[PDB]
Amino acid sequence: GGGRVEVPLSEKLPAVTEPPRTSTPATKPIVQTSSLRSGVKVASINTVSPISSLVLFVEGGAAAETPATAGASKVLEVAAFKATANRSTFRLTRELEKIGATSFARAGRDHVAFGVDATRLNQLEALEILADAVVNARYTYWEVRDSLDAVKEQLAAQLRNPLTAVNEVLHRTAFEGGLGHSLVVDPSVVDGFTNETLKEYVHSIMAPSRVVLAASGVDHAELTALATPLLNLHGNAHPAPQSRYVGGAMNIIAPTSSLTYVGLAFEAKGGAGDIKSSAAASVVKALLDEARPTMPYQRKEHEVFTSVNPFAFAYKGTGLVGVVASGAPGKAGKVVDALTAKVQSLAKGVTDVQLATAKNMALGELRASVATAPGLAAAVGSSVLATGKFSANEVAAALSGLTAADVTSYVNAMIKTAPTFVTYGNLSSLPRVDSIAKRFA
Amino acid sequence: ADVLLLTWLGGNEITPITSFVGQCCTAYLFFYLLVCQPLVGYLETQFAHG
Amino acid sequence: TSLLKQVALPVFNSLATTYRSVVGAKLAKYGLRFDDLQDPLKDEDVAEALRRLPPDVVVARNCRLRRALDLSCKHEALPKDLLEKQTPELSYLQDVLNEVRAERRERAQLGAPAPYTRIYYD
Amino acid sequence: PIGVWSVFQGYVTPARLPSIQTLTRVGAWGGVVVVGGLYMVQPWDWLA
Amino acid sequence: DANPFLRFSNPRPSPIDHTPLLSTLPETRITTLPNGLRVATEAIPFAETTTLGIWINSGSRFETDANNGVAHFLEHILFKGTKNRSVKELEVEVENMGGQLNAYTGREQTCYYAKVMGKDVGKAVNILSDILLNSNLDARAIDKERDVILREMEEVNKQTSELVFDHLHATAFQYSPLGRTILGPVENIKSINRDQLVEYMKTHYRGPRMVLAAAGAVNHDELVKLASDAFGSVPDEDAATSVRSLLVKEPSRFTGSYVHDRFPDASECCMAVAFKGASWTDPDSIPLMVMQTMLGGWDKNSTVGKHSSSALVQTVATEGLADAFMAFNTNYHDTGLFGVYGVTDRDRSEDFAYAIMSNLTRMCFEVRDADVARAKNQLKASLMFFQDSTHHVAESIGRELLVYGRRIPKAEMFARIDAVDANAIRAVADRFIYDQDMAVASAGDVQFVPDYNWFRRRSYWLRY
Amino acid sequence: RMHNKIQLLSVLNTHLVAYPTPMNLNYSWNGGSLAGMMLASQMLTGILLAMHYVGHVDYAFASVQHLMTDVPSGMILRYAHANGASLFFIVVYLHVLRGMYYGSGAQP
Amino acid sequence: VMRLSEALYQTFFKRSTVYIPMLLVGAYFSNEAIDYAVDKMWTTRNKGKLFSDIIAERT
Amino acid sequence: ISFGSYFGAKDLVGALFLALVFSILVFFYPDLLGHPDNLIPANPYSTPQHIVPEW
Amino acid sequence: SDAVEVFKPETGLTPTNRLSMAPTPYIKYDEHNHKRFPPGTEGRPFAYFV
Amino acid sequence: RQNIPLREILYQLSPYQQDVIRQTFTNAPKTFLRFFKEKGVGLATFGVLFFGIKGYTEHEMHQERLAERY
Ligand code: HEC
Ligand code: HEC
Ligand SMILES: COC1=C(OC)C(=O)C(C/C=C(\C)CC/C=C(\C)CC/C=C(\C)CC/C=C(/C)CCC=C(C)C)=C(C)C1=O
Ligand SMILES: [Zn+2]
């Protein structure tokens, strides 16, 4: 028979505290970074968590796509962690499921990320599986052909949300170059896709100076010493189509959209490279948070709006801070007027309580992004890929050291720059486009 | 040929030479049905598509 | 017996080459390849490996099969100009089928069955 | 390709074979047919 | 063979010793106030965020027929204004501490909690005590929420899985308190008022049934002082009206039964089959956790389902029997539920049902050791993933003090998991599954779901 | 179609009229239909024979002789039924040898 | 209300290979009892008329 | 190809060959494949010299 | 997924919609042919013995 | 019925625009010789084995009858 001691009772003398308590480190751990002799940068941060997260960041995404290889990042999200030169798909799946580890492939607009999350006792297995699935991937014909269907329903489901479509068209209108390409493409774009297209895209994006290995809860010396023979990469840097902000306006026609969506955006100058400008953009995003759901079942009523959803994206060298607001189909001009009034009242000055509230909201978001080990590893990897360092302490200091005059100056400089304007839905009521982009001038 | 020989032998009388030949024919019938068909067939598959 | 087995390996190669030459001479009169003899209804590993091929290869295989069946119905052979171009030992199915069989061997050592069944028509 | 072809290819491992418990549960059907035959014939006290 | 790419890792499932992970896991401190309220903290050494809240051993089970739905209506009302703070005052003060309040109401458990930063522990304690003790419960807000609930009831605005599970609880626990829904019927909402809410909170929200659990960046002594200042005025509990006396007075009953909710033009076919499982205090609940890991779960957005370790996941993914499914293991104070829930359509519903029944009965006879070692490793890894988020740490602290009576240490939990072997799995499956009555619930396009006799016949094998 | 309205005509059409068959079958694929024809012939001749045969000792030999010399067309019926067993076995044996030659019993 | 015992279930009912020989011995004894009852009733009713009654009478 | 058109006449040809052999066996050599001893009435006390079955 | 988009029910407080949104634990079966046992009656059934 | 991907052009002629039995008299010796060339080895193997073993058995039977002959 099995154990019969009930869980309200303590387990018997075969329940030992044989591992002693290890003493805590004296200070909060710092991020330690170096570079391999192949040129791949390795950055890691130690944690007290029992979960180690390993993520591999490669420059690419929608910004590295061509018209021939259109939608290759979305296919790479599904086709990753399959048969390699050393393991089959069955062997990799069983080796991940044996240690209880999880894998993801995640494609941004300027990068693709591959990651394995496991416990602290299986970090060598996770590192070896991740490196083998990234470096030595095969991308066989039949597996890509069978994955294309699931890619098509995942894109079709992701395009059901109007905010995703508005974000795509807004990035198209705001930028010319790499950042204007479409991430969530139409399903019919990848109808002629083959494994040669994915192999061509992977050969373009892969280079030793465009790959960053980020780890959370892993010793740095051990990680470099055991990843030197695994991340010895070769290849040439395919040219990157640098993007520029130009602004403009566009439209979308949706036949059975029960609402109408309006997007307004500006450029965050400096991109992710400038700490202060990104902090000010995050504060502006929090200042535009009209209906934040801080409590269950709370009903904040607006006169015109149905939903408000701001954002602040910080790419390399340039950014895009703005707001998307919904509304009734017959009240779209009122939605535009209210959005312009909100940005103009922000430019008229912020009043102490709002500044403190938005600073606390930005600090809470920044600290809750890095609370878990996979989130911290992703943040370290993205920051090192975009800049060369992780500066969360400096970002928190910039958020806390922000005055109302600096924010008012930031919004004043924003409204002088030409904006980006996108509509959506069965558009049967709209003010003319010339008067749309006049209220900030 | 083995099966037709067994058909011919059944209409004869019992004789030591016919007993010996019938025993050899029965042994070869079992040998073909149980040894030639799996093993020679596997060798043919290894020759053709191996 | 390993020393006699080492002597039997060039013997195995010699009998394999002689068999392949004779059968390929018999095969080329119908335009068939060696890989065209494998039947999906007979073997589920072949049925799965044929599913992993690009469609032009399957079209070419089906055309060769129909040509050979027409020749068999006519009790004829290929013309000599066409018969001189035949290459019955050109492989299109061997690597795919080998990888399918290796996958089925690797799954069986851990207790897993094959992820494909026999073909049923009912 | 069901039968000797399965064992020539290496598809019959120590795994995918029936366990000892499975063979014992199948092997317990040997007594059922013996008891059924003895019930049908009834050769009482016939054991030598 | 690659030298660096083929070491350290292999697909052969072997038991892993998780003992060195116990050296750095933090400790839980519990302090019992004279009120009877327990204050339990778990300090993570370099955390910047804090989850803290109040867990209550109450819910829809401890209601009556007359006030069924009061506990769910309470989380609609409680955040709409207190006697010291208005709606806007509460909104501004919560916004300034950078967090969000949240609430869950189960059949037997209720929590109200806050995810804040470490500098806002005392403010969160004060706010949580303010909603919990000094609420307005205004009749105008009650009328303003009654009509919204009545509209979403008239529209049948519900998740499909929640619909199926509510039908399953209603038919498996007939004529017992666990068969009621958390939402309650339409008539109780149509005749709700402030008096019932006051009486429910006065009866059930007492000292020995309430845990203040905080995890992340928090000091134990300061939380003790803050809780004694704020939550020190809660009434104590009579001995005659404790949780155990209420459990004895109205016990749970399991009845083998069948229900389907048929719709004329639906597309999906959701179905759940459950057996009577174990209570929280049964020592067989750990093998049921291992068996639930062995059955696993799968949805069709994954493409590696054919290489799964689980045989049920392999069968469903290879033959395409369901769009998604999951095995569940629900535990209550004196009973439980164990089974599989899935989503399919009407042409694959019988084959999915057969796959569920055949994989459940198979665990009584043939269980190999590799599957058990794999499931033990996966369950221990899943337990280590919950330690990464302070919200899950606080939730586990509250749940474990409410339902076990104590904080089970991680070493004891690993030792209790490691004591499970294949014979234990066969014994527990024989106890709970083999030749037993089950409960069947379905909703949607369910005209081809087999009836109860088909499900009852397939709980045993005639060939052994 | 007329065969699509009566279920007997649908089965007969599907399995005897429109059934797809390989076009390169030679004359060694006629063993089965010949075996079926011989089975039907044996059944017919025997059912006719059993109307003049008496299954008792001291009547069986005399009933076969009365069948041979006195029943109209009885000698034809007896000799046909006797040699039809031989031809039935010839055809079935050649059928089995065909299946042995071509490996016709293999999967599926 | 009335319910089969668990310990008696685990012995003679859970496996078919144990259930079937028990079924056969119960069938044997049921046939013996039915034979005994029918023969006793027939011999009691028709006493003095059978052949064995005349033979035992002539002893 | 369809069975009922193409393989009906092909079966009819072989059936006509079989009917020719059958007619030869019935009408010209009716006792060729048999045994002459089966034209003797059965005697349980006297056995024939050679006891062989049909071919 | 939502039941309004998947099951697509009619709107209203019909008898089927009331049980769909909140099923009752007081299920009444028909008892003209068979009277039920008390709910939660445990034990292996007596019908095996019969 | 199955779907077979295939690229071809098929030509068929009417049965009444062709001769029925007039190339049989021309192809008859070639068909005979091709049949015996294709199946020559197996028929020879069967005949040699059957008739040689039958002749050896018959000769030994005659010898054994002569050995007991007075
Ligand atoms: C021991 C084996 C065996 C015996 C005896 C046998 N068959 Fe066949 N039969 C087969 C096989 C195998 C096939 C499939 C041949 C193929 O498609 O290659 C077949 C095919 C057939 C066909 C399709 C046409 C053909 O000839 O290929 C018919 C009709 C047929 N059998 C009828 C019969 C009848 C009627 C009998 C007896 C009265 C019989 N068979 C006896 C094995 C046998
Ligand atoms: C596979 C072979 C076979 C089949 C099928 C068959 N028989 Fe015959 N039957 C024989 C043989 C051989 C004899 C012996 C004939 C003889 O030597 O006179 C015989 C003899 C008989 C006799 C005795 C009279 C006589 O002349 O010998 C009768 C009556 C008879 N069969 C009836 C039937 C009937 C009725 C059927 C079918 C419904 C049938 N047979 C089918 C082989 C067969
Ligand atoms: C490889 O391709 C194939 C062949 O090879 C070209 C075949 O040959 C056949 C099968 C051939 C068939 C079915 C026709 C042969 C005849 C048979 C089996 C039966 C013989 C019956 C006859 C002559 C008439 C019987 C008459 C009566 C009245 C009996 C019925 C009784 C009643 C209605 C009461 C098939 C399926 C085939 O696929
Ligand atoms: Zn509710």
Provide a descriptive summary of the structure in words.
The PDB classes it as membrane protein. Keywords: Mitochondria, respiratory complex, respiration, alga, membrane protein. Structure of the Chlamydomonas reinhardtii respiratory complex III from respiratory supercomplex. The structure is cut from a larger assembly and holds ten protein chains of eight kinds. Chain D has 48 residues and is mainly alpha-helical. Chain D is built from three helices and no strands. The longest helix of chain D has 13 residues, at 29-41. The termini of chain D are far apart. The radius of gyration of chain E is 24 Å and the shape is globular. Chain I is an all-alpha fold. Chain I has helices at 3-6, 15-21. At the A-E interface, helix 2, strand 5, helix 3, helix 4 and helix 10 of A face helix 2, strand 4, strand 5, helix 10 and helix 13 of E. The complex binds heme C (2 copies), ligand UQ5 and zinc ion. One heme C (HEC) binds at residues 42-43, 46-47, 49-50, 53, 64, 78, 81-82, 85, 88 of chain F.
Compact summary:
Chain A has 441 residues and is of the alpha+beta class. Helices cover 38% and strands 17% of the residues of chain A. The longest helix of chain A is centred in the middle third of the chain and has 18 residues.
**Major sheet summary line of chain A:** 6 strands, mixed
Which structural category do the helix and sheet elements of chain J fall into? mainly alpha
Morphology call of chain J: elongated
Query: How would a crystallographer describe the biggest sheet of chain J?
Result: none
Query: What is the first-to-last residue Cα distance of chain J?
Result: 77 Å
Number of strands of chain J: 0
> Strand fraction band of chain A?
15-25%
Helix content of chain A: 25-40%
Bound ligands, each once = heme C, the ligand COC1=C(OC)C(=O)C(C/C=C(\C)CC/C=C(\C)CC/C=C(\C)CC/C=C(/C)CCC=C(C)C)=C(C)C1=O, zinc ion
Main location (chain A): mitochondrion
Family (chain A): Belongs to the peptidase M16 family.
GO cellular component, one term (chain A): mitochondrion
GO molecular function (chain A): metal ion binding
